[PDB]
Amino acid sequence: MREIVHIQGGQCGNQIGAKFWEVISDEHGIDPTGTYHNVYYNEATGGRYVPRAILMDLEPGTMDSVRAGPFGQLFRPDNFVFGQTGAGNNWAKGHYTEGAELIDSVLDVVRKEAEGCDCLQGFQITHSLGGGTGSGMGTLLISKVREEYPDRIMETFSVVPSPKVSDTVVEPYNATLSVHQLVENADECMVIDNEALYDICFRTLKLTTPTYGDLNHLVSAAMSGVTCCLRFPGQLNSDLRKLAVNLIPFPRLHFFMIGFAPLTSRGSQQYRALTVPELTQQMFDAKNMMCAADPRHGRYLTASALFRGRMSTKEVDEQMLNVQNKNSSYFVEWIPNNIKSSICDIPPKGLKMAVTFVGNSTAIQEMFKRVAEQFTAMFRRKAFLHWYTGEGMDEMEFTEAESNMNDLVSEYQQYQDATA
Template structure:
């Protein structure tokens, strides 16, 4: 049995984590009627001797014990974590798993990375080490954060670097939420996102990209199919772990579902299991090109099996804006749950082969898993994780937004006031991003030269 530790940083990271733990407990309750502590529970929970009255309990070796999340909760202010401490999930976390500040990072990457990150390094390492020592076989870390604000972008990427230094053998899977230009309420988010992107490129093993606007678009698709007007957040009939629905809960549900689907094979049995370490091994052919585009399906309930695949590869169903039929696929994982057979999987792979362009040196770049345990509220689900050059448009947009702000040196003094911050950090981060974009462009160009014209026309249709 292998285990993973979830590190939640900032308001966004902790809100997503809150939804993840709630839904993970629902799956645990559904598929474990006996309450015995088993391998499925042990992936993300450990059984502790503590016995508070508001916890979740299991039986281990004939003794009643309390379930505790394998998690570390970090923030530079107390708001969201304070709500978790008072909410229904409070029994999952001990004080040794939580670290908060008071004043916040002020939407400043430098403050989160260089001030709070340096000040709290020893405490963060100690908390993460405690969580790791509770694992018999630590396999991976999941880091949840946003890139628009100061805490998620700055402290979040500081933690990522610490994980690489302290636990170099454990896989680092990062889920960052990127803001969109359309509804970004943090004027300096291009600075924060660019500085964070360099750290993600240098220190992560896999990055499952998420965009705020993409999440809203997915919700709007679901709302329209239910007869609701566009712009309405479609909420599932799920009990909120805070006792009431918040505006971002429906968006966070999508990300939490992605995490549950990604880890289902590690938690439950299936005819084709995929170990978490296999994601990086099979989907990342080049160390820096470890950015994955997730697609979740179904967005709309009661979809047929073949439509499940069609939805996953339809434009606008990705958690980050990247048209799957335009980019070059370096590799793609299909992770299915529920009543799906191997023959169904193979048939649909053959169906989509002519529509998706794979790298000439990896024409059969599919990695698949089948988990027999379906999601709590659906009979089946599909998570596609595509390593595609289509992500370069996301990074190009970020580069353009940064340039518009940086050429005027707007708000720059707020960053340079932080001890240890230098203007060269921006130039180095921009150079790193442009180099990343160029690597994707070069792969596109090389593949175009090696692909016969007839095949390119077939894909274009």
């Protein structure tokens, strides 16, 4: 049981959710038709399994496109929360004028899906920080669900403004506005960025003609591997809360980087062996992360690992022992045995092993600082402001968002080196 509800947001979040449901259907043996050929699905007369997946957005072209592609019959025709105007890359648009009139349609449907279960252990949001809709609308949904349900655990698979270029000109504004309302009411922010995702699909995988469905498939395989330890048996099982405890020692430093494995070349997929020491090499390799922040330029406040496949436990023991042994000061030493380990008992579709590494570390603080830097630049010199200020927002909130980001990062950095 121990339910999940899959609310989406923005065209990004919509595509990622579509492909994630594709992956979970293809894993649980669910067709695009919705049969078997409940921890994620719901029973429906006629022998159907409907995903309790809500797609909300301020534009329907995304809605139409996600309906059009394969696996579209999964989502039932009520959870398509239709927006007609579009926030148009404006946090004020996506959070105040259209938020405060979409909140409650979403409230009725989320109460729908929440009473549909018995025990809703955790939520599920995938959205953006830069798009007006995604950012504002999504952090507003987060605030609302965290207002009524204080006992659940919040979780966002969040895409941030890209380093080399900003996807939309107001990426800094929307991103700081999203994190300022993310810190207190979002319990686990898995930080992803389109550019690092590009890097991981490019470097070791031969992919020369990539596509957004491809990156969605990658991050959705990761998104399935993070929790696949829940719905399946295992010698040493976990959940969202053992993970949350072993990951956050403080309610603030709870933003996590994620990676999934294995991922190698296909033409070279035969020449290499395939073992668990090789899995450790694969992801404790710096380049295998899904965030534009090499974690070995910082420190690991703690890190959790979740296996998939049936091998021994001698493995995971020597695993985190060996890795702590050499990359010790790459972690933080003020906390004992900072690596947590669990095992899911089932391997992936067609392959032998899977591994998911999640990390509560202090290298995303530079991501936060680069966001705040771009923000402050466009902010003092007043770049792209009337779009936010002529729609019932003031820059007092912008100042406080920027300063709050800076406060978060100041704790991140001092906790990097705090020792006793």
